[PDB]
Structure formats: C-alpha cells, structure tokens
Design an enzyme around this catalytic site. Structure first.
Site, PDB file in Angstrom:
ATOM      1  N   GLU A 119      -5.827   8.015  -0.984  1.00 53.76           N
ATOM      2  CA  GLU A 119      -6.110   6.758  -0.304  1.00 53.76           C
ATOM      3  C   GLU A 119      -7.129   5.872  -1.013  1.00 53.76           C
ATOM      4  OE1 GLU A 119      -4.396   5.538   1.884  1.00 53.76           O
ATOM      5  OE2 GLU A 119      -3.279   7.224   2.716  1.00 53.76           O
TER       6      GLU A 119
ATOM      7  N   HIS B 174       1.624   4.356  -2.867  1.00 55.01           N
ATOM      8  CA  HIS B 174       1.827   5.799  -2.700  1.00 55.01           C
ATOM      9  C   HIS B 174       3.134   6.241  -3.323  1.00 55.01           C
ATOM     10  CE1 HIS B 174      -1.811   6.391  -0.529  1.00 55.01           C
ATOM     11  NE2 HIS B 174      -1.416   5.838   0.602  1.00 55.01           N
TER      12      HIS B 174
ATOM     13  N   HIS C  55       0.853  -1.208   0.000  1.00 53.74           N
ATOM     14  CA  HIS C  55       0.000   0.000   0.000  1.00 53.74           C
ATOM     15  C   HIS C  55       0.885   1.255   0.000  1.00 53.74           C
ATOM     16  CE1 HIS C  55      -3.547   2.428   1.632  1.00 53.74           C
ATOM     17  NE2 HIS C  55      -2.510   3.210   1.862  1.00 53.74           N
ATOM     18  N   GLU C  56       1.821   1.328   0.959  1.00 55.10           N
ATOM     19  CA  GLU C  56       2.770   2.406   1.007  1.00 55.10           C
ATOM     20  C   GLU C  56       3.585   2.590  -0.277  1.00 55.10           C
ATOM     21  OE1 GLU C  56       1.966   4.435   2.917  1.00 55.10           O
ATOM     22  OE2 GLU C  56       0.769   3.195   4.220  1.00 55.10           O
TER      23      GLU C  56
ATOM     24  N   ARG D 171      -8.983  -6.208   4.783  1.00 59.11           N
ATOM     25  CA  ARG D 171     -10.128  -5.347   5.037  1.00 59.11           C
ATOM     26  C   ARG D 171     -10.931  -5.189   3.761  1.00 59.11           C
ATOM     27  NH1 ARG D 171      -6.899   0.540   5.768  1.00 59.11           N
ATOM     28  NH2 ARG D 171      -5.523   0.377   3.867  1.00 59.11           N
TER      29      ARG D 171
HETATM   30 ZN   LIG Z   1      -2.508   5.112   2.309  1.00 56.62          ZN
END
Ligand SMILES: [Zn+2]
Ligand SMILES: [K+]
Length: 414
Positions: free
Chosen positions: A259, A223, A219-220, A362
C-alpha cells in the site's frame, strides 16, 4: 500524440461473440459457482459485472463484527440486476477512457496489456513453458444442451469484478511456498471495485472531498501492475508510519508495504532504505532468472504446444525489457531494469496520478475518512471523462469544488 490502447463500448445485453464477450469460470470467486458474462474492454483487460467474495462461506450481508462507519458499506442487492450490471460495465469503460486522458495513464494501461503473467513458476523446469496454470489461465465456457462446459481458455492480465461484501473496500487482497506475484513471474490480477461508491477525506465541514473514482481505480490497477510484473510485496510486510514516540507508544495501523508503494510519495521513505533496496535487488534477481529461462526453453506443458515457444519468448522478452547480447541470448540491461522498476514502483503511484489528473486527493494513505458518498458518474452533467466531477457547471472546475461534498448536490450521502 502518445500511444493509446482503445477502450470498447459495450451494453450488458450485447450477445456473446466468442471474441470479446464471453462466459468465464472464475473459481477464485466463491460467491459465484457458475460461469459469468465478461467483456474485454481493452486487450487482456476484462470487466465482469458480478459481486465477489473469496470467503469459504460467502455472504454479502454486514457481518456481526466491527465495521467502519466511514470505510464500510453493505448492500447485498447491489449488482444483482442486469440494469445495475450495465451501469457498472459502462462506469468502468468511462473510467478507462478517463485514465487515457493523460500519458501516465496511457502508459499504465500499456504496461497492463503487455504485462502478461509468465508461463511458469519456480517449480517449472528452466527449459519449460507451462501453459496450464491458473495464474495465467481463465476458462471459457459455453452452455450446450442444458449444461455448461469448458471450451477454451483466455490468458488475461486483469479481471475487474464488482465489489466485495464491503462495497467501499479497494485495498489489496490478503495474499494473500510459491508466490509468483512476488517472484517476477507475476499472476493475473483480480480487482473488486464499485465506481459510484466513494470515500471521502479532508484537506486540513467545508474541507471534505470525495475521492475521484478514476484515482481509486488507478490505485487498484497499480496493484495489478505489481502483481503482473511479479513485484507485489506480501501483505505480511508492514510498518507503522508513526510511531514511537516514547513512553506512550504505540502504533496506529500497521500499513502494508504494498500500500505505501502504491500510494507513493514521501511516506514510502517510512520503510527503511535497506528494506527498499532489498526489494529491488530481489526483483532484479527474478528478472535475471527469467532471462535465463527464455534462453533455455525448448519444451512445453502440454508437450504438444511447442509451436508457442517463439511467440512467448517475444512476449516476455518485451514485457521485461530484456536486451540481446552478441550471442543472441536475452540479458537484463541494468539501466532498462532500473527504468522499468522505477516506473512500476514510483512513477505509477497515487500521488503522481492526483497531480497529473487535476484532482483533489488524500494527503496520506493513512489519512482519515469521513461519511462516504454516492454519485451517478454516467451522467455527463455530473462526471465527464475530461474533467471528472470538476465540471464548468457551478464553477466546479475551480479549486476541485466538484469534489467538495457541501458544494456538490450530486455527491449523495450513502
Ligand atoms: Zn491499495
Ligand atoms: K452533497
């Protein structure tokens, strides 16, 4: 077989070698004002086992303000010892090898490696590469005769620090005039992660599972992808994924576009289609700008660095997937642009990783959390490159039960 960038093993104690183990000065880290030891685990991807804070008066202590019982954890002593720094280094290494387990991750890693931020911004004259900016450069220092001095620069893609004061906080930094990370040029990316400290979620007590740290890392790095390719959407831009909802509105959290895009899936469509189209045509315009620049560059900053022009025209034309026309000019091929942009903003997303890696995750970005946990991911009886927590041990390979808090004694309460 699919193209795979190698990930190098290191010990924290391995001596500096003027190649892939260096001392670096990172001014963006206000908590540390001296050079710090760094390790290049894959080309342009450096691990820096240090705590981070960009706050003016930085402190790793729990602040006297509201904090989450489920999404915050403070420990000022964490990552203060060399042992802990060795553990951290080896943890990131292991996660990168786990990333490489699927072709989607192999491609993500390549995008980061070849995704070097541009030598220039919108202030830079069109005919000029500027090699002097802190968006591309980090200083290499050496301690000589009792003091530190700058000796060189590196041009990394991603720096991976240890955590912020809130050890659970992986969210995109608030940018955050001139914004190269939103104008195609891109900027080097600084991450702050903590792979043994894990958030939890419910698949709806028996329904509670930990996030696999490879998913958090990816996820990072998604980004980072956005930042490097200059399409990182300003933390300004938010939308409530509810909402109104009528007389007893209003909003849950205002969630960043950045996000939602990074998480992916159907929630992205919370953002109106016109705004999403506008973000794409913005990128397209910036990429076309950069094509023009490559066509026109004939000088540099510093003035004497002209022999680097051809090297970098090739690096950037490859990064942005440009074609040549019949006149030898770089051009944006719209199909190639569409493929790159779609990879960067759709294929590379958390819900796709969760599918590809056989991990529970999630449901939504804004899904709730439960009590966080801790795990020693370097123990292969607990966590492997091939399988994460979902080992054959105790049947943990069945229904992601390795990630289930009640089933797995290795997922320790924080
Ligand atoms: Zn994030
Ligand atoms: K447990």
């Amino acid at each position: 077989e699919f193209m795979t960038w190698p990930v190098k093993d290191f010990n924290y104690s391995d001596p500096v070698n003027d190649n892939d183990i260096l001392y670096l000065r990172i001014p963006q880290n206000k908590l540390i004002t001296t050079p710090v030891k760094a390790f290049m685990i894959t080309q342009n991807i450096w691990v820096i086992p240090e705590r981070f804070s960009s706050d003016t008066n930085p402190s790793l202590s729990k602040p006297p303000r509201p904090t989450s019982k489920y999404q915050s954890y403070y420990d000022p002593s964490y990552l203060s010892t060399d042992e802990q720094k060795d553990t951290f280094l080896k943890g990131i290494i292991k996660l990168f090898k786990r990333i490489n387990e699927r072709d989607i991750g192999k491609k993500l890693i390549n995008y980061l490696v070849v995704g070097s931020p541009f030598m220039g911004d919108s202030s830079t004259p069109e005919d000029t590469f500027d090699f002097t900016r802190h968006t591309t450069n980090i200083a290499v220092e050496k301690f000589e005769n009792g003091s530190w001095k700058v000796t060189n620069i590196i041009t990394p893609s991603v720096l991976i620090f240890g955590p912020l004061p809130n050890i659970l906080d992986y969210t995109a930094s608030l940018t955050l005039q001139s914004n190269p990370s939103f104008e195609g040029f891109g900027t080097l990316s600084i991450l702050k992660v903590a792979p043994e400290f894990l958030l939890t979620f419910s698949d709806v007590g028996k329904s509670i599972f930990c996030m696999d740290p490879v998913i958090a890392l990816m996820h990072e790095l998604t980004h980072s992808l956005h930042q490097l390719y200059g399409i990182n959407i300003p933390s300004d831009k938010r939308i409530r994924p509810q909402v109104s909802e009528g007389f007893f509105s209003q909003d849950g959290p205002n969630v960043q576009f950045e996000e939602l895009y990074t998480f992916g899936g159907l929630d992205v469509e919370i953002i109106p289609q016109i705004e999403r189209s506008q973000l794409r045509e913005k990128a397209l315009g910036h990429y076309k700008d950069i094509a023009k620049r490559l066509n026109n560059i004939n000088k540099t900053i510093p003035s004497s660095w002209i022999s680097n022009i051809d090297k970098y025209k090739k690096i950037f034309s490859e990064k942005y997937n440009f074609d040549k026309d019949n006149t030898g000019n770089f051009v944006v091929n719209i199909d190639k642009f569409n493929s790159l942009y779609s990879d960067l903003t759709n294929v590379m997303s958390e819900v796709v990783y969760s599918s590809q890696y056989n991990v529970k995750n999630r449901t939504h970005y804004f899904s709730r959390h439960y009590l966080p946990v801790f795990a020693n991911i370097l123990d292969d009886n607990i966590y492997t490159i091939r399988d994460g927590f979902n080992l054959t041990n105790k049947g943990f390979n069945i229904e992601n039960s390795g990630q289930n808090i009640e089933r797995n004694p290795a997922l320790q309460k924080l």
